[PDB]
Design a binder for these strands. Structure first.
Ligand SMILES: OC[C@H]1O[C@@](CO)(O[C@H]2O[C@H](CO)[C@@H](O)[C@H](O)[C@H]2O)[C@@H](O)[C@@H]1O
Ligand SMILES: OC[C@H]1O[C@@](CO)(O[C@H]2O[C@H](CO)[C@@H](O)[C@H](O)[C@H]2O)[C@@H](O)[C@@H]1O
Ligand SMILES: [Mg+2]
Length: 580
DNA sequence: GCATCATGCG
DNA sequence: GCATGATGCA
């Protein structure tokens, strides 16, 4: 049962073949400046295990790692690449990443280790990482004999599985998606994460002080209005104060009691002065806990930078996700929270932050896919799409569109991209199911192509078992055939939404690749820092702004060619906040 | 660890 | 529609 391999004490030529499955193991979940615990190499000559302090000090091995002509097959190459970057070592030649391959074949599998990807092809001669390392804090690196065999078995699985995975990707028409989009993007994300974003800690601390002061005042006021103290952060204790001691009406409940969601308190506001204070308390509380205290906990004490990790193989639609910290959900809606962005500054003196965002990319993608004449014309005229929708569904001229009409039309546009149900829209606009249904019907009468698309995509999902995006990303929807209305409807909404949200993801990902190629050709110092679904944030010398003002929008606008143009807005400033 | 709440794009 | 993080409670 045991797998044979050479536990080498030194690097040999045999280990430097031009094709190999490579494992550069980083156990710590956050791989930034993290230890490399072992290395495994499997190639035509055999299976090998190398101690990191040995291999990484070896000139020949380091050169092999950085030789683009020496191809390597790996699992989560970004993790290895970044861990190596922190050690001043360059990893090149990665031609196949099993994590990304598994992710494209089926995002729903949740593949997060070699064992999980291998099980997809009935290969089980490798143990799950959790089984070897354990979970929680009790997660430690085992003794060399156990560690070495595990790394070798993972390398062996990768070595064996590359062909079958590539073959299936090819069958799915996803070969270029892996090789020309996701794998090249992985390297770009690695550079972004490694570069990090500089944070003005002093600014954050000051804000923390001011918030703590405002919180104390709002908190005290709340007890003053309740006639007693209690844990406002406790939905249980709060519910007792609102619906029992204060007798506020119950407009909706929760599984474990009464509902105190923002959707509820907003309606209870007129009944008691305490509600507005609770909502405000929650706003400030979120800024203090997650964006002030939380951000400060992950800022590197020396460089004062934060190094997020973009999970490239998690979302069911093809989007990236961000953690430790999540730099894709920094406040911007409310001024008080938007101020947080003043804390994100350029990493060098005399540099500025440049941000470019796609304008209505999802609705433009919908116009393209549905080939709706009315919607395509609206974007060809670059009209305010919400005002346009209002004009159509409410049957009025532009001058007759009131602010309330535009607000409701905007809610309709948000919901249409995922076939929002009448109940879903009714809740968002706080109206009846019938009224919401009338809005939707009015929308379909004005945009018949979109109605046709929603009908056709659901049927396609049922016929094929999955839906696809512009660049051939796919998502299986087995629930589309369920006899349970709720479960089936949810699958139907996913069928309508995935091609839209997914294609928008495809487009910005390609723009990122195209952009880096352009920056390199022009030898600009500018570089990417973050991506937030519809936007790209970079930093660069103040002397490069004029060139970026022309280059970035163009690359993003020309990433793909649709039936409607793509529009990109951009801003730059001394801080992320100022890049508006 | 599940539930509820907040934040982002839409 | 798609995400992450902090909190309370058990
Ligand atoms: O390295 C990122 C890559 O690893 C996975 C597991 O294979 O996620 C791990 O690392 C993330 C970043 O620290 C953690 O959020 C996650 O909990 C941990 O398992 C993949 O999901 C990801 O693509
Ligand atoms: O009236 C048909 C209409 O209903 C939807 C759901 O909104 O689909 C239902 O009917 C289809 C048969 O035409 C089934 O395939 C599907 O499973 C069922 O939910 C729309 O897609 C369709 O336009
Ligand atoms: Mg935008």
């Amino acid at each position: 049962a045991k797998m044979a391999f050479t536990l080498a004490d030194r690097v040999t030529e045999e280990m430097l073949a031009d094709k190999a499955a490579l494992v550069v193991e980083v156990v710590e979940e956050n791989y930034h400046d993290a230890p490399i615990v072992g290395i495994a190499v499997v190639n035509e000559h055999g299976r090998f295990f190398l101690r990191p302090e040995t291999a990484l000090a070896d000139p020949q091995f380091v050169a092999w790692l950085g030789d683009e002509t020496k191809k390597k097959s790996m699992f989560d190459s970004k993790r290895a690449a970044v861990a190596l970057k922190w050690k001043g070592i360059e990893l090149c030649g990665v031609s196949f990443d099993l994590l990304l391959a598994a992710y494209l074949l089926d995002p729903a599998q949740g593949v997060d280790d070699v064992a999980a990807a291998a099980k997809m092809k009935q290969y089980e001669a490798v143990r799950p990482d959790e089984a070897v390392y354990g979970k929680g804090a009790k997660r430690a690196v085992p003794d060399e004999p156990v560690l070495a065999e595990h790394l070798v078995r993972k390398a062996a699985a990768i070595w064996e599985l590359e062909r079958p995975f590539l073959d299936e990707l090819r069958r799915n028409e996803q070969d270029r998606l892996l090789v020309e989009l996701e794998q090249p993007l992985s390297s770009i994300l690695a550079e972004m994460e490694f570069a990090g974003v500089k944070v003005d800690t002093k600014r954050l601390e000051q804000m923390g002080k001011e918030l703590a002061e405002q919180l104390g005042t709002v908190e005290q006021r709340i007890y003053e209005l309740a006639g007693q103290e209690f844990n406002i952060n406790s939905p249980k204790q709060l519910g007792v104060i609102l619906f029992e001691k204060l007798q506020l009406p119950v407009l909706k409940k929760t599984k474990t009691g009464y509902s105190t969601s923002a959707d509820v308190l907003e309606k209870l506001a007129p009944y008691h002065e305490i509600v507005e204070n609770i909502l405000h308390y929650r706003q400030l509380g979120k800024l203090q806990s997650t964006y002030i205290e939380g951000l400060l906990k992950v800022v590197r004490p020396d460089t004062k930078k934060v190094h997020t990790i973009f999970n490239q193989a998690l979302t069911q639609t093809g989007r990236l996700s961000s953690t430790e910290p999540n730099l894709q959900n920094i406040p911007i809606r409310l001024e008080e929270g938007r101020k947080i962005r003043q804390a994100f500054v350029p990493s060098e003196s005399d540099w500025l932050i440049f941000a470019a965002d796609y304008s209505q990319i999802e609705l433009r993608v919908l116009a393209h896919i549905a080939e709706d004449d009315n919607l395509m014309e609206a974007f060809r005229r670059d009209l305010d799409i919400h005002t346009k929708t209002a004009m159509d569904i409410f049957q009025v001229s532009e001058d007759e569109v009131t602010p309330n009409m535009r607000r409701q039309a905007k809610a309709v546009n948000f919901g249409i991209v995922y076939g929002i149900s009448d109940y879903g829209l009714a809740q968002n606009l706080n109206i009846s199911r019938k009224e919401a249904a009338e809005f939707i019907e009015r929308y379909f009468e004005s945009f018949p192509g979109v109605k046709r698309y929603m009908e056709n995509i659901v049927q396609e999902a049922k016929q094929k078992g999955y839906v696809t995006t512009l660049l051939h990303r796919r998502r299986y929807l087995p629930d589309i055939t369920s006899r349970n209305f709720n479960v089936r409807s949810f699958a139907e909404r996913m069928a309508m939404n995935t091609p839209i949200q997914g294609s928008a993801a495809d487009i910005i990902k390609k723009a990122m690749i195209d952009l880096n190629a352009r920056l390199k050709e022009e030898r600009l110092q500018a570089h990417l820092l973050l991506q937030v679904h519809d936007e790209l944030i970079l930093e660069a010398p103040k002397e490069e702004m004029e060139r970026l003002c022309r280059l970035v929008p163009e690359v993003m606008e020309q990433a793909v060619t649709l039936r409607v143009p793509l529009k990109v807005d951009y801003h730059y400033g001394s801080t992320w906040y100022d890049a508006k």
